[PDB]
Every structure is written in C-alpha cells, then in structure tokens.
Amino acid sequence: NYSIFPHQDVIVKSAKFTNPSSEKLVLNRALSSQLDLPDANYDLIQFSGTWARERHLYRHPLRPGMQSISSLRMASSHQQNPFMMLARPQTTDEQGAVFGFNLVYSGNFLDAIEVDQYSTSRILTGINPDEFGWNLAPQATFQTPEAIL
Amino acid sequence: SIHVNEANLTFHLQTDHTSYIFQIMKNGEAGQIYYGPRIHVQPTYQNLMSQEWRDATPSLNEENPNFQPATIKAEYASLGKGDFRQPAFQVTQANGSRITELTYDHYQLLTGKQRLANLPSTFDDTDDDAQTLVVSFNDRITGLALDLNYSIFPHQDVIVKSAKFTNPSSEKLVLNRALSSQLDLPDANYDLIQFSGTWARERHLYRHPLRPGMQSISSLRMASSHQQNPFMMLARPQTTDEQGAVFGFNLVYSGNFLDAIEVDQYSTSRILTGINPDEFGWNLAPQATFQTPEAILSYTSAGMNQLSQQMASFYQQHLVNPRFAHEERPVLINNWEATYFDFNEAKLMTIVNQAKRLGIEMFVLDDGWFGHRDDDTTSLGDWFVDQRKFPDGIEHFSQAVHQQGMKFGLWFEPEMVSVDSDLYQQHPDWLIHAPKSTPTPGRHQFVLDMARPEVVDYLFKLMSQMIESANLDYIKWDMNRYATEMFSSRLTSDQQLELPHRYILGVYQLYARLTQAYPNVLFESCASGGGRFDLGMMYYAPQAWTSDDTDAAERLLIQFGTSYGYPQAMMGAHVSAVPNDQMGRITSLKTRGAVAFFGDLGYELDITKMAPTELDQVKKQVAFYKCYRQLFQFGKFYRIDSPFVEDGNVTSWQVVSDDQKQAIAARYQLLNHPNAPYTRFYFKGLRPNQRYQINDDPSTYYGDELMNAGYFVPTILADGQESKDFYTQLFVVTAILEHHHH
Amino acid sequence: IHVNEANLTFHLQTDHTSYIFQIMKNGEAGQIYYGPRIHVQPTYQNLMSQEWRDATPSLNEENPNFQPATIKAEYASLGKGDFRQPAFQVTQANGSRITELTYDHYQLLTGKQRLANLPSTFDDTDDDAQTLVVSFNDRITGLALDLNYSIFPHQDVIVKSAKFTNPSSEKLVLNRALSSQLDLPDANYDLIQFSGTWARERHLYRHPLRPGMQSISSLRMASSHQQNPFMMLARPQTTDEQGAVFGFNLVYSGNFLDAIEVDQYSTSRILTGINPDEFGWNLAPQATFQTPEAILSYTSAGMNQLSQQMASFYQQHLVNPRFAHEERPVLINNWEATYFDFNEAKLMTIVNQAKRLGIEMFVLDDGWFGHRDDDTTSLGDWFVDQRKFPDGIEHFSQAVHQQGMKFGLWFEPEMVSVDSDLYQQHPDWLIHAPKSTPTPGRHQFVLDMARPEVVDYLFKLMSQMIESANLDYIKWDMNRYATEMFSSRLTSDQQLELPHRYILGVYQLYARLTQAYPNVLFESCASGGGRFDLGMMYYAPQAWTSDDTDAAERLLIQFGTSYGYPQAMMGAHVSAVPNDQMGRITSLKTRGAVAFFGDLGYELDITKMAPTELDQVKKQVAFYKCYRQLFQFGKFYRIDSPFVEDGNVTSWQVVSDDQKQAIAARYQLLNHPNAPYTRFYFKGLRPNQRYQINDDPSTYYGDELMNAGYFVPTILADGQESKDFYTQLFVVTAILEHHHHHH
Amino acid sequence: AFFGDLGYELDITKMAPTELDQVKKQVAFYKCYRQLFQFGKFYRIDSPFVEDGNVTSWQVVSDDQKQAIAARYQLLNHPNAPYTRFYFKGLRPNQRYQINDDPSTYYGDELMNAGYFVPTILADGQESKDFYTQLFVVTAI
What we know:
It is classed as hydrolase. The entry lists the keywords nesg, Structural Genomics, PSI-2, Protein Structure Initiative, Northeast Structural Genomics Consortium, hydrolase. The entry is titled "Crystal structure of the alpha-galactosidase from Lactobacillus brevis, Northeast Structural Genomics Consortium Target LbR11". Chains A, B, C, D: Alpha-galactosidase. The structure is cut from a larger assembly and holds 4 copies of chain A. The first copy, chain A, is an all-beta fold. The first copy, chain A, has strands at 2-5, 10-13, 16-18, 25-27, 31-37, 43-50, 53-61, 65-70, 84-87, 98-103, 109-115, 121-127, 134-136, 141-143, 147-148. In chain A, the strands form 4 sheets. A 7-stranded antiparallel β-sheet of chain A has the order 1-2-15-10-9-6-7, with no helix packed on it. Chain A is globular. The two termini of chain A are 13 Å apart. Chains in contact: A-B, A-C, A-D, B-C, B-D, C-D. Chains B and C meet through strand 11, strand 12 and strand 13 of B and strand 12 and strand 13 of C. Strand 13 (213-218) of chain B pairs antiparallel with strand 13 of chain C.
C-alpha cells in the first residue's frame, strides 16, 4: 500500500498479507516499509536515551553492515524512538537533503539501515522481527502498521 | 546602490544580494556594522551598534567608559588607541611615534569606477551600475590624509576596496604598513579556505576551522607565491560547492601579499589583505601620496560555485583586459617540452607545417631563440636573434608561419639577467645585489632592478622593436626565479624597504606601456607556471600558464583548485608528452586532452614523432574543441565531485552556456577498481523543465531528471589493451527545443 | 652534550631526548634531529641528504643542490634563499638587511649561570647541567652572535637563547631577535595553545597544523590574558596519558610571539621569543643584546609527563629558591569582602575571626593608600591613608603579628592616576605620545618604567613600606594595558625599544626588592592572570591565577594552566556566592575543593557567616594544612578533561614522592538523572602497593585502582540542595605492614 | 514549558504571594498566545546537540508570520562574554516587527540576516545566572 499526501510531501506505506491458499503459513518477519537507495553517504540521526532522559539526538555516518535501533519491551521504548532520519553529511536544521521515517505503531519496532557491498542503503522500519511470528491460517490476513516516509 | 544617511553618517552599500554597512562614530573613526545578505536601509542601526562594558580593556575616556575599541568592529584600525588586534595600517613620525588618530571629514559619491593611475585595477566601462564611495579622514596628530575607497558592483555582488594615503603636512611620514582592506565580523565560526602548494603542484585546496589567534598566508618572494595564492574564502562550517554562506577575498596585486585572519578574545574575526607589511616601508614626503592595491570582496548564501561564478563574471567585465576578455583564445603549439633547447629554424618548420595540418592556429617559439642561449645558464637580457638557429633572424621564421595561416608568438623573461651576457658587461649595476653580500643564483641567473625607469625603458625598446620586427601576435612573459639579497643602489638607505613594491610597479609600467602601444598583442603571464597567477597580471594579460605540471592527473588537482578563484578562461592548459617529464605518469591521449579542454587548449609535444593514428586523434580533438570553444572557455563553470573531499579519486566539473541549452560535463577517475558500485553522475546548472539529449544516447531527459536522480554511467571495464587508470567520461548535453505539453 | 670537533656536529642528550645540529658547508648551523634519544655518531650523512628541487635558489654554481628552502635551520635569516620566517634580521647603516652568519668557534661550560638582567635558568643544585655556546660572525657587518643551549638532562629540558655582539664600528639595528627556532621534518602535529581573556584565562585549543602561519602573540607589553607564551606540538593521537609532544615556553613577561609555519614541503618552523612587531633594538658599537630564554622539551610518554618534568625543571632551576619548596600560607584577602568600603576597625574584626579559623596570613588589598575610596584616584601615592588608618599601617600590622599571623599588602607600582600627588610632581612620567589624546584604562595610565629615575622612586617607596610595616608578603598587581606608547627618555630611533625596556624596568624593580628583602613573598598579579608567565615566577613564585574565583570557571582555568604551570604557582581563593563576576552559586564544599589544588586562600567576609559555615571553613583549613605538601607540591596528573568530550566532568590527582599518598578529585558540572555507573580511574600509583580510600574498609592494589577503576556512588537528589557543581574527593593512603604477596 | 502543553506539578499552596503572582501572569501570558505556542510552526535554532550545547534556542511563528515568539536558553553563564546575536527564523523579509519592549521597528530581513543584539547576562548579586531564559515576543506593526 502507498498513500500519497501531496501537500505535506508525505508518503504512507504498509503491507497486507492474505492467505487464499489451503495450507498454513507463518510470517516470521513483516516490515511496513523497505527503502533502497543508490548510495550511503548519509548520516543516521536517531533518538536515544532512557527514563528521565528520553530522545537525545545522536548523529553518525553510515558504515558498511548493520546499524539499527529497536525495542523488545512490547512498547516503543524510552531507549530508542521509532522516528529516524537519514541526512546528507552537510544537512542542517536550515538546509539540505534529508529523509524522515516514522512508525504508526506502539509495540516492538525495528529501524534498520544496511549498507551492502556496493555502498547502497536499505532502510527497514516496522514491527521488530525478533519475538514475532504470525500464524496466518487459510484465508486469514495480516495488516502491518503504517510507515510514514 | 550606495545609500548615505548624512544625519547619522551611515554608509550602506547594497549589491543585488548583499549589504555592507559601516558608520562613523563618536570618536571619528569608521565602524563596521554588518556585512552579509541584504537587509533594508535604515537611518541608523542602534541595536547592532550596542556597546556594553567589558573589564580589563581601555576606554575612549571618562565620559564614555563603555566605548572600548577592543570590542568595536572596525573598518580600518590603527594600533595604539586601545585595540590590540592586527592593524590595517601604521605610520611613523619624525619623533619615533606610531600613533594615529583618524577623524572623519567628508565623503564623496561618484558614479562608475575609474582605473587607478599606475596599478592594475577594476573599472566600469560597461554601464553596469557601479558606484564609488570615497570616505576621507584626517589624522589629528600628523595632519595625514586618508581616503578609503569602496566601489559597489551590484550585479556580481562584488565590493572593491583600497586606501589612498595623502600627506598635506610639512613633515616626512613613513608608512610601515598599508593594507588594502579590513573586515571585522561578529563571529568566528568559519573555515579558512586557502590555496597552497609549490612548483608543479600549485593551489591545492586546504580547509580549516578558525582558531583563536592568527592564521595567515603570505609571500616574501617579491611575487605572489607558487606557495600561496592571494585568493581565500571564509565558509560557514557546512557550506559546500552547492550551498551555503561564504565570503571571498582577493587582491589585484602581484608582489608581496598578506591574507591574515585574527580571531580575538571575543571570538570575532578580522580579515586583512594587502601588501605584506613585512619588508615594506614607504616614505611619504610632503605633498606625496601612496595608493594601495584593490582588494576584491564578495559574499553569497548560494554556495562556493555561486561565489566563483560571480567573481568570474566580475573579472570578465570589470578587470581583465577588455580587448581579449571575451575573445576566443587560439589553439597554440609550443616547442618547449617538445625539443627544449635543441632546435633551429629547420626542425622548427617541420612542427609548424604539421601544426597547420591538425588545425592548430598559432605557433609559439619558446626559450632558446636569443643570444647564445642553448643552456639555461646564459644570455638572459640579450633579446635579439640567435643566428646559429635562425640564420635569417626571426623576421623570416615569423613570416613562414604568418603565411601558413597561423598567429605567431614568442617567449621573453624581461626581469632577468644572466651573468654571461651582453647586459652584464654594459650595466652590471642593474643587477639586484646587496653591497658586501655573496650573490645567490636561481636557475643560474639573477634579477634586474625593475625599480629603475631606465631599465624599464631599455626593455620597452627591445620588446617594441621585436614586436614590430616580427609582427608578433602573442608573447609569453616568464619569470623563473625568486629575488635574493634585495638591494638597489638607486634608492636611498631609507628607501630600501620600498624596493619590492617599486619593483612590481616597474613590472606594471612595462606591461602597461606595451599593451598601450600594441593593444592587439595577446600576452600570457608565466612564472615557472603561475608563481604569479594573480589578478594583477590578469588586468594586462588575460591568461596565465597555470602550472609547469602538464600531467593530466596533477592538472586535475591544480585546475580544480584554481577554479575556486579564477575562471577557466584564465588557465592555459597543454596536452603534453608521456611519460610525463616532471614526475613520470603515463596517461591516455584522450584524458590529457579532456583535462585541457576546460582552459585555453594548446599543445606542447613533438607532433612530428606521432604515428598517423595519434596525429589524427589530435586533429579530432582540436576540431571538437573548436566546435565547443565558446562553451569551454567562457561557459559558466561548475565544480561537482571534488578531489579534495574524501578519497578524492573522482573529480568532476561542468560548463553551461548562457541560455543553458548546451553543456559539457567531464568525470575523471584516478584509480580504477574491481567489482564497482554503479556510477551515478549528477548534472548541475540545467533548466529543470527543459528536455535534453546526452551524447549519442537516444532517450530524452528533463533537466530535473539529470540533476536530481542523476545519470547512469557505464562501468569502466578492463579490455586487456590499455590501463583503465586516469580515465575520462565526457558528456555533451544539448537541449531538445520543441513545443511540448509538459 | 657531545661535540665532534672533526665535523662540528653538536649533539645534546638528556635522559630521553636528542637535539642534534651541525655546522654546514656555508658556515650556518643545520638542524638534524630532535626527538627521542638516539646514539651519538660523528656524522649523520643520511639524515642530512640533499636533493635538487626546482624554482628555488641554491648557494652557488658548485652546489646546485644546496638550497636553503629545503634545509632545516637552527637560527635562520631572510634573504639568502630561505623564504620562511626568520629567527632574526639586522639592518645596516645603508639599509641592507642581508646577513651571512659564519661559524667561528664554540665553548662548553658546566652548569648554568643566571643572565645578568633577565629572569633566567640556573643550576645551583649540582644537577649535571651544561651550557654550550656556539658563536658565529657575519661576513658582511662584523656582528657576532652567540647561540646558547643549556642541557638539563634529568627533566628532559633544553634551554635556548641568543646574544648579539657588535664589534664593528658602525651602528646595527635588530629588527627581529627571536629566542629559539626549531625546524622539524614534517607537519603532522596539532598545535595546542592557551587562549582566553580576563576572568576566563587559558582555555585549551587543539588544532592540526596547516600550510602557512599559525601563531599567537602579544602586543600589550605583557604576556596577555588573551594568549599565553606556553604551547605544545602534539602528534595527532597524543593525550595526557601517552604519546609524542613538544613543549615550548618563554622566560619573558612582555610582548611575545609563538609561531609555527608549515612550508611548501610540509616542514615546520617553531619560532619563539620577543614579538618582532613593535620591536627594534639599536645596537651601537661594542654593544650587546641578550634574548630572554626559551624553554624546550619533548617526551613520548604523553602530556602529563611533559607538564610534570617541565614543572620539576621550573621548581629546581627557575623559581625563586627562597620559596620554590616552601609551603605557602593560607591567606585571607579583604578585596571581594569589602572592596574600598573599609577602615582599620572593620578589618580587625576580620583579622580576629580569621585567626580562630586557623588562617595564617592577612592581606590588605586595594584602598589603603592616598585617598583610594574609588578606583580613579591616588594610584601613585604609596603612603598611608589616615582616614582609614589613623596610626599608620605600622600599627595594624603590629596587631596582625601579635596574633601570630603574617601580613601582606597590595601595590600597583607601574601605574599612575591623574588625581594623584605623583602626577603633580612628575607629569612627564606618564607614558604618552606627544600630541595624542590620552586613553584611560580603568581610569589610570602607566608610568614610564623605561626610566631608571622611576624605578629608584618606586624601590625607595616600597622598601620604606616593607621596613616600616614589616611585610611578609606583597600582592603586586597591574590593571591596564599601555596605550599611545612613547618615551621622552628615548630618542626617535629608540622608540621601538620601549616595550622591552619597560619590561627590563619591571625586572629591575623585582630584582632590587627581592635581593634587599628576600623573606618577602611576592604574589604576582595582573587583573588576575594577565601576566601569568615564567618571567614572573623567577621572582614571584606564585601568581593570582584569575580574577574569576567561581568554582566552575576555575576548573577550566586551572586545568588549562596546569599544562604549563604546576599548582604551586596558582593562587586560588574560596570566594562568596552568588559569584560577583558572573552570578553562579556553588556549594562551599566545591569552592573549597577546587581551591585546594593550588595555594588556598579566602576572599570573603567571614564576619558575615553563620556558625555552621564558619565550622566548615575551619575544617577546610585543617584539612588543607594536613595535606599541604601533597596539594601544593605533589606530582600532578590530569585525568578527565573539561576540554574533551562534553566537558561535564573534570578530574585530577596529586601524588607524593614515594607514591604512598594521593588526593584525587572529580567535579561534575551538571547533574543528570538515571545515570551510568561512575568509574574513576586513578593514575600515578604503585601497581603492587596496597591502598585504602577514604573511609572504605576494603584494601586495593594500585593496579586495581588504575586498570579496573573505582566505583563511585551516583549523585542523588535529596530535596535539600542543588546537585550541580558536585565534588567527589578521594584521599588515598598506603597500607604499610608486612604482607606475603601474590603479584 | 510554554513550548508545548503548559501544566503545573507542584504544591502551589506552599508558595508565597509573589511567586503566586508570577504563576498568575505566566498562565495569562500563555493563554494569550496559546494558539501560537501549541500550534505555531516550530523552528529549531541553536541546538544543544551541536558543539558545546551551552545555548538552546527555538521559535514558534503564526501562519501569516505577523506574530511569533522565540526563546534562547543558556545553561551556564560565562564572564566577560562575547556579544550575543540571536538569529530569528521564518519571519517575512519585507515586514516590519517589534520585539518585546524595544522601541525600534525591524524589517524581517534585519532580524534574520544580521541578527538581533541581546544584552549580556549580568550578575546582580541576587539570583544565580545559570539556566537563564531570554524570551522574544515578535509582533508585526
């Protein structure tokens, strides 16, 4: 699913799984949004902390392999918030290219940016794959929470 | 335009996009208010001129404790009245004292901008809405008179600054220091961006945050360095070629300079540029005056490309010799790296006849044609034919070329004198030399005393005679060493510190008088390849031999660095022999050429020695260059991928025509790597809503496609034949003009 | 020091470093190497290799490859093919500025003697020092130059200077006379400087070198508040714990230059000495000129090590020996307590309370002379003000002394107010440029110290006061910067000699006062730390570090000062709150705890304090006294730096000689909730020695405390006080008893 | 707390009359501008996450840009300080504004490009000068 809200430059994404078949299927992982990008010259900006010190801003250049924030506490945590940004190195509050990403969801989440062998980026947001598995019986459906891009 | 508020003595210069604002204050001196993006004219700026008490620093007086020069942004400060920052000037009296108390007297607002009388300088010949503000002062102590000149060039966002000192008093005054411009800024969050290097590796880009105290670049070499160029920038930390606030500063002068930046106790910046205060002293007699070179200032919010481009336009209309500033430059051939000293009119006509066949348009006869010069060791100053290699003198050779359809130019090194030459037997007193000192050679030669008018006259005669004798179309004017043990016997003992500057003035006299007399001869300035690549020269000679380094990969860094302060129209660039004579690199003829297109193309190798296939490639290169010459030489220049940022393995820039309907981009890669990421090239400078075609690719692209999403470029693959290193990808972009329902 | 006379290779060896240079083909001295110690060798043909580079002059035609632009020099001039900045320059009668030094002879002495008229370094402690004097002559003017180099092997210090001699018959002018030049082979260093201003001196700044000039300087006839003469060149990864670093300081107190130039070939010239700007010295025939001394030093063991050795060097070979090692008294000063609003009776209440607290010395500050009821009058009238002292000062000190206490008072000698008896007696004594409008500084002007009549008048006035009032101590302040510089005592040509002469004058005064009354402790001052330099420590073993006496601000100021100066040199007073300079409020515990790491003093109206507050102070004083030797002279380690990271935590440590006692301190500026666990890492202890910390009953091996750390209790809210600006103190005691160890 | 949803969480019965009065005016000030505080377009300016983070600043602006409020916060006061210059965002360049009780009127572009000079934070011997707030109410003429 792709919902365009032209006047705010927002795109909303989700996935929906239907099992028209007759055999039992299990979803081990069901993310709301994957974004693949031509390069990796971006900073991941994130919001981390804990109780009484939530959502301080951290800003780190992407590097090959995995960088992610996530919760396993059945709540989007105090520790890591679902909203994240990929910004160009020279981007500021006042100027420059940048992407925002959020989750309309309040449980276990995952924000993940993977830089692969060719220096491209994959951005994954949605329900945390760890501690998750939906039993999708014949004719059943699974709707993922919406991702705000 | 320039707005004055007489009631308040507020001076506000507005370019199309910037404001430079200064005010006369209770103590009579000028005080900098603001310089940045344009703001509304006001009668006065009280809030910005707010003063607060600060401890442990001197005050004006007891009625004004809070008036403290240490915390007041100045426009042209002295040292000794409470400010301990670096001064813009300094004057010594007869009694030893160095105190000056400038006080405002009157101003003057003139339309346009006239040349200075004896210095290269800026002008408004083109109804471009320039104005000049002259603001005068008198010293309460010495009677000294000072004019500060600010000229607004509104359409290129450029301000030009200089000082003229006048002595209407009856007592001798010594100018210990006379800078061209001072800017005081309220903060110090900038990077200093400079252009440093040396011979064969000039003007590499260096970028550094400001720190408390002094950070300067300068020259003592009696010339603007190979080591340090006068052009500099203050960029905000996040500013790039594509976006952001940045100040640019330059200096129309070719002698000793200072670009200095002091960050003081209050994290404020002072930017001073002008003649280097070191090895400088000027005796200002009664009724005497002294004019400083012009500093060039500019600001933009729109990034460093924007900065370069408006200063480039400014130089093109307001500084560079008008006779050539917009005239296509010829594709020359040179015999320097081709043969060096080993030649004569015989082997030199073989290269001339071959030149014509390739489409080349001018032959330059380089070093070796005079006196008995077969070594780099003899004959400098003997500017007449070497009859060993030119039996019938030069008139003959220059004619053989004129008839093959080609312009002819030749080489001179006027300021120099070789010990083994006719000049040193006739005028040994014309060598620059300290009395009991042991002379120090540089390239086995010494330098003429250019402060001597007679020497300038002797040189104007030799070159006049020679330009008429041979019908010269061009002159390469070199300068191959740095003066040593400076002393002139013509000057008083009190006048010795006047030498470096009087010397440069003498250089200017010569250039001035030659260009006056032969307005049609094209000059190329040279100093071992641009150890004098500066605006001072560009006034007279509209191009310079960028660098003696002719290697394609090294030229990438030099041309890329130089483009910050100077348009490609100003950089000579030659395709040369491989492996490179200076450091030994092997490049493809395709690359060496592609790098030279973004300048004033020319060739500097033995073309007689080429196989028929190579010969034909040159021929195609020259035609292609000619086809697109208006765009290579004068096109709006854009830097893209920088060699000075990250691995610096990829370099890319682009040129775009006035209407933006045509462009040529080039991407260069030093080292080729295996299993490579896809290439995506982002074009700059196009029209978003204009469709384009790119080389022989069938598809059409809107400009926002090419700029935003970029253009996919095929991987560089090994073919077993040649090295994939130092590799070039050209992109000829052309509008598809057509009605369309977008 | 090892000389190879056959090759004229001079090679200096300290315990761990080697400074090596060589006399060269053209007669000038060529720098070879300065770095960790390397073996003595007759010649270093390898290190001295020369190659042809283009577009730069060569010596002559026989040696194309001898090019001064690519040759590391020891003391270079401009004009001979080198275009870098020169160490010196000389103008002849004819205007020529060319100079051709040519080596003639050398001399090797033992120890090190003071300089005649300048503060300087000495070896009177039989410490294996040596002085090498390398003399040259100019082929052009006949001028002679002595290059001095004293080795101090045990602190890894080499001290440098220059002395110019004119044996010719013609006048010579020195336009530039630096004290030290050092050329290094590369430019991969960070320049570390100490910049600031009044009430915020000497914050640390750390920047990578770049092509061109990066310097810091002073044009204010003092090393400034703004820039200190001490600097470092660190390798990029050097820290306080590990790594290579050079240190440069200067025994001078006037205009200085610290300059580092990276040339076209990425080499570095470090120049240090008198600021070439606003300077020029007329050298008549038979005349001489001595530069102030440059201190040089290197280590591979990091910046703590650099400060520590340099500090051992200063304590043994620079500081006034009368006080170098003597514990400094706990004092109280009435400045921030009363300001000008006081009289004898009011001050007696202070002196009396001060005593019951255990304080050891009272210091009467500004206001006792002439009619000082303001800061705009009587500056110059160094005699008793009878409105506030009816029976002269002699009485008030008699009282102080009968109390078993010491007495000190405040002068500002170099200064003159227009409303003053002095001005009406010698107006011509004000530094003033003939036609100019006099520019006030804190409503005062400066005396021409360049005149020997002035020094005599001041010496007489001050000694009369030391004898009359039996002074134990003098605070010698200096509260504005000179302006419109001129001396009628000097000719037109000598005007560029005022700044240095004025400084020599100050030394003259300190020199005569300290020789005639050597039991007087001089605390140097300049609106706080506006002259905080080696030049003054020679005479005055301690300086008033900053007028800023806020706890939080001092952390920064002291941390930075310690890179260049040991705590023995830093006065520090516990002041009142909310701080008068900038308004911060701080616990009395913290103000106390930042001030222990220096020379503790009190600058508050203790007559206006509650009983519990008084008791707190009494205990700070007993505590400080108990550990005074440790606090003032113990080896100093910086740990956590307010100049690294977010700067929220500053910590340091002083350690005894035998490493059996230590006091550490951690200060946090801002408290944060739900915090990480604190681990403090002690430095400077003996690995296998067992220690105890405060009242914690456990015993720890040095290596536990240094490698694993010490867990420290989180700072918690208690509903009673702010937990900002918090201090944790750690008293470390060695357990001494027989023990069967398992190491 | 103004830059959000204002609320109180303390024993207001333990305060004194003048503190009580301060909260009274705090609340009236907030309601007067609640529409702009809660829903104005929000701009971050000086970030505590960049460099020393000693200074924090932000601003809310109305839809028509004729009205706005800014706040600059300073954790620790420092002596002998550089002059302060505050740069406003999001105003209209050619529109004239007033600021708090300043009598002058400034064009949008002065306030955004040149900045607005803010007086030093001075010690007064009465209160700490740490955690200091400078509030600018910005109104079109």
